[PDB]
From a paper:
A cryo-EM map of the mature-like HIV-2 CA hexamer with C6 symmetry was resolved to 3.26 Å resolution. We observed density for IP6 in the central pores of both HIV-2 CA hexamers and pentamers, with clear density for R18 side chains. Density for a lower IP6 was also clear, though in the hexamer, it was less well resolved than the upper density, and likewise, K25 side-chain density was more modest. As had been posited for the HIV-2 capsid lattice, the central pore appeared most similar to the open N-terminal β-hairpin conformation of the HIV-1 CA hexamer central pore, despite HIV-1 CA occupying the closed conformation in the pH range used for HIV-2 assembly (between pH 7.5 and 8.0)85. However, considerable details underlying this structural plasticity differ. These differences also compound into identifiable changes in CA assemblies, with the central pore diameters expanding by ~2.7 Å in the hexamer and ~1.6 Å in the pentamer compared to HIV-1 at the Cα position of the R18 ring. Specifically, we observed an exchange of polar contacts, as the hydrogen bonding potential of helix 2 residues Q41 and E45 is met by either Y50 and Q54 in the hexameric conformation or N57 and Q54 in the pentamer, allowing a change in register as helix 3 slides along helix 2. In the hexamer, D61 and Q63 of one CA NTD form interactions with residues of the adjacent CA CTD, K170 and R173. However, the loop between helices 8 and 9 is shifted in the hexamer structure to allow Q176 in the CTD to contact residues Q139 and R143 in the NTD (bottom left). For both pentamers and hexamers, one of the most striking features of the map when compared with HIV-1 was the stronger density of the CypA-binding loop.
During HIV-1 or HIV-2 infection, the capsid is a necessary component that protects the viral genome and recruits host factors while trafficking to the nucleus. The capsid is comprised of approximately ~1,600 copies of CA molecules, which oligomerize into ~250 hexamers and 12 pentamers (capsomeres) to form the distinct fullerene cone. In this study, we leveraged the approach of templating the HIV CA lattice assembly on liposomes, together with stabilization by the small-molecule host factor inositol hexakisphosphate (IP6),75–79 to produce regular HIV-2 CA lattices. We report the first high-resolution structures of HIV-2 CA capsomeres in their native mature lattice using single-particle cryo-EM.
Residue numbers in the entry:
A (entry chain A), B (entry chain A), C (entry chain A), D (entry chain A), E (entry chain A): 1 to 221
F (entry chain B): 148 to 221
The structure:
């Protein structure tokens, strides 16, 4: 992280143990639950990359997924190098313009990552760009770990409509589905993959019911 | 959240892990108990919307209810857009006047949400307006989850008048009932849905007893 | 709560989660033990009313007692309105003189509650007056929940004089008894409601023994 | 407690929940172990009396002992009133010279207790004097609760000399014994109340052994 | 650690208990897991050597490994002494130029270690150089404790391809293997040491599959 | 019929099925994005297991042209 000073220059405060441990305990307990994606951001809102890397590295389990995230950061990295050019030999006295690897803090140092993140001429935040990339690797894994696809989430003889709708929506977000499909699935597949006795009551409501109405109606059916 | 500086402009401090976890542990343990509504406010008294959204999102369970809250924020959102007009093309150099979605921080950024929340000309607090909306979705769910309606809370042969009155009042607040009804239910339905032996003693007190008198009298009856 | 600033006006800091939880865990575990009364004050020494109300409200159990406290705050409230007059239409630009409900923060806002609590002309602390009222409702409940009245606390064949005196004094404070009665009960009823074998030894000490002497003497009797 | 300010007067910071709870958990678990006396001081090094009283009061158990402490504070209190005279009617504008009860903060307020504790003309610390008194009541109780007197701490066939010496010294401090007696008991009663086989070996060392020598020698005897 | 002051010189703040305990609880629970290496750095980002030494020393178990680390710090130490010369008798008034042992803080004091770490003429950070050395001793131990070598990590009849790849990669990093070998092992030995039924499906993908494809394909095979 | 009910018969080709699917996809006036998801997924899910595995062996995000050729005589 970065803490500024009065009469002094910006300094690098370290990351904190509690936070390093919470991220570790949100991935080893929730088994890369979708929520892992925001937990990470919040725990990292103001962490320079060197620190983000130390956190992800403390986790020595689910190491296949972490490798997948590393592959994704390198692929996104290639795009930034291609789209952003080299101004040419940059005159000594100037910190090298940032690349996808310095953004990570691998080849670069925290002090240089703070320098770009705050340089007055063109501040390049090498702290938030990296997290975004990590979040695409985390998100794919969540999608690789939705044990049930939404088309298979249905209702058994003794399964109600409140637990089923919970199992459905939780998967729908984790599949990283788009919005229009979300509504169609929400207004149709919810009723299709259900017990018939409750289905008749959800259909008794009328057309385009609301989740409030669907839930209240099928209370005890 | 927002922390101001001396010699510097307002900055965005992040939300804290402990608080993100407490909200999560007040919803997964109390099963959206009514108290969830204030716990949220207190945990969020000074959180800009971006953060309020990160908290609600970390919870990946009870996701049906969270969807209901999202529907409610969008419905209230339509009202604000209708009631509050567009001054027209706003001259470049001016931050767009706030809408129901920027209030959420979805399409907007925290820096802009802080800018309106503190702009000197007409400070628009986009932090408290949003929470209020979230609280109406949370409140409906509590009402959707009062397992017993107050008209069904009664006294069995071995149920006393202290546990029953507790089960009654807890439901009365969670039903989000109005005040005049609250008093009538309080002075009448409490005695009606009760064991007769205790009922005779509560009636021996006189007319319009006080909960102190009702409770002390039916001690052991 | 209220935190003052240098070069800036007083601000409202929020209440803290840990404290909201401790009050909740001192009432759901001690079952409104007498100590609940001071725990509250200490946890609230510098909390503006809006916050005191949020804490009491997070507790959704023992809700009958909380209603009793609400009745007591309204009754005390009537007294303040009667004793303190209305200076008449107060000129615009002046915050309304405080009433029993603003003291609670119900109809009022924290900023106005801080304004009176610190107004230079006649600072009206709307923070401590309210707590005092809450403490009379809490105290009555403790008295409504002393399972044993002091006149019934006695000694059985295998009950000693150290556990009995503990059960006696704990009730004596919770009954909210007065001081002169406290001494008479202390020097007389302690010996009366006791095992005879120990009674003879407590009486062997002489007249007006001291709890030190009474306790040391009946060691093993 | 008291926190001073720059450009402002001294203020009263409150006591903290964690500390109120630790004192409570050092008395309900250690059953007024001697260590309770220092735990209290350290937890209270800078607490004005009002707070010291709130802590002791949160403990609603072992209430006989707390009453004994209250009797002791009143007895010491009489001595201060007798030894320290009344300068006579003190001119309005002057805070009353402190008495044993204001030192407690009972009849007095924290602001007045801070005023004497810091008054420039003759600062009277009403914070440390009170604690000292509380410590004499706590100490008597520890002495009233040494289950074994040192003259009864001895060695059985299978009791060694390391556990016995531990049981002996722990009692010796809790009896609040004097120093000269401490040495005689230490160099004599330790050997007297012991197993003979180990006694012969402790005596083989010579005269006035040291606890290092006594302990190393009787290793396995 | 080191905290600077305004109007005063740099001071040595101490290390914190929680951190001393976390390092101890990351080595006695993870049994020198590879992650121990970064946990240490993060917990020590800004700790002067004297403190780093106090932490490692609190751990009294796995003391063979700590001795190995001590041997490694002494061997690296010899290199620094050889490569860095003695400018000769350094004039009194000048702190001795740093050596490998002062870097540790053994023969040196924290104040001198802070003086070099911040001396304006040629700041020598004796805080980060030491940690680096400790990290080579920690890393060797992790390699001495990879119970399974990657050439022995294979798939049994009921072992899938997700747990196996996890056991493989975790070892690959802990063996401290190089990058080119990492890719060859990754694209070849992963398929070789596997169940044949899944092997046929991983081979059905084509050539140079990606861990995403390999993992999705062998789902249920 | 409807697209969430259309299913390839056990001894029916997945070709007969696609003609009973795209015909019912346009009729339902399904949105274009909802069309792509149903197209790349709901076809394979509501199909014979043998051809479902054969199209799954075809690879990721297959194209209908390839799906038809691979499930030929499947
Ligand atoms: O008291 P809190 O500030 O909420 O902190 C709690 C816990 O509280 P309790 O003692 O009431 O259970 C302990 O706090 P401290 O006593 O150390 O202040 C301590 O527990 P652990 O060491 O077991 O984690 C840890 O706080 P800290 O960072 O101050 O050590 C943290 O633990 P939990 O979050 O697990 O309750
Ligand atoms: O951890 P933070 O979120 O920054 O909170 C700090 C921090 O809490 P911890 O003690 O749990 O680390 C301080 O740490 P220390 O200075 O004790 O190391 C503590 O200081 P004090 O206990 O000395 O006051 C202070 O305490 P408090 O909550 O009583 O103000 C507390 O404050 P916040 O939680 O409000 O930030």
């Amino acid at each position: 992280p970065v803490q500024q000073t009065g009469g002094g220059n910006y300094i690098h405060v370290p990351l904190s143990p509690r936070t390093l441990n919470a991220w570790v305990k949100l991935v080893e307990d929730k088994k890369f639950g979708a929520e892992v994606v925001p937990g990470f951001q919040a725990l990292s809102e103001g962490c320079t990359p060197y620190d983000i890397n130390q956190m992800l590295n403390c986790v020595g389990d689910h190491q296949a997924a972490m490798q997948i995230i590393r592959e994704i950061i390198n692929d996104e990295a290639a795009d930034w190098d291609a789209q952003h050019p080299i101004p040419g030999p940059l005159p000594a006295g100037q910190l090298r313009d940032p690349r996808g690897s310095d953004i990570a803090g691998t080849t670069s140092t925290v002090e240089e990552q703070i320098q770009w993140m705050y340089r007055p001429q063109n501040p390049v935040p090498v702290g938030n760009i990296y997290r975004r990339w990590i979040q695409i690797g985390l998100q794919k894994c969540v999608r690789m770990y939705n044990p049930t696809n939404i088309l298979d989430v249905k209702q058994g003889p003794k399964e109600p409509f409140q637990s089923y709708v919970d199992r459905f929506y939780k998967s729908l977000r984790a599949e990283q589905t788009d919005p229009a499909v979300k509504n169609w699935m929400t207004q149709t597949l919810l009723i299709q993959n259900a017990n018939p006795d409750c289905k008749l009551v959800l259909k008794g409501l009328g057309m385009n019911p609301t989740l409030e109405e669907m839930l209240t109606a099928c209370q005890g059916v």
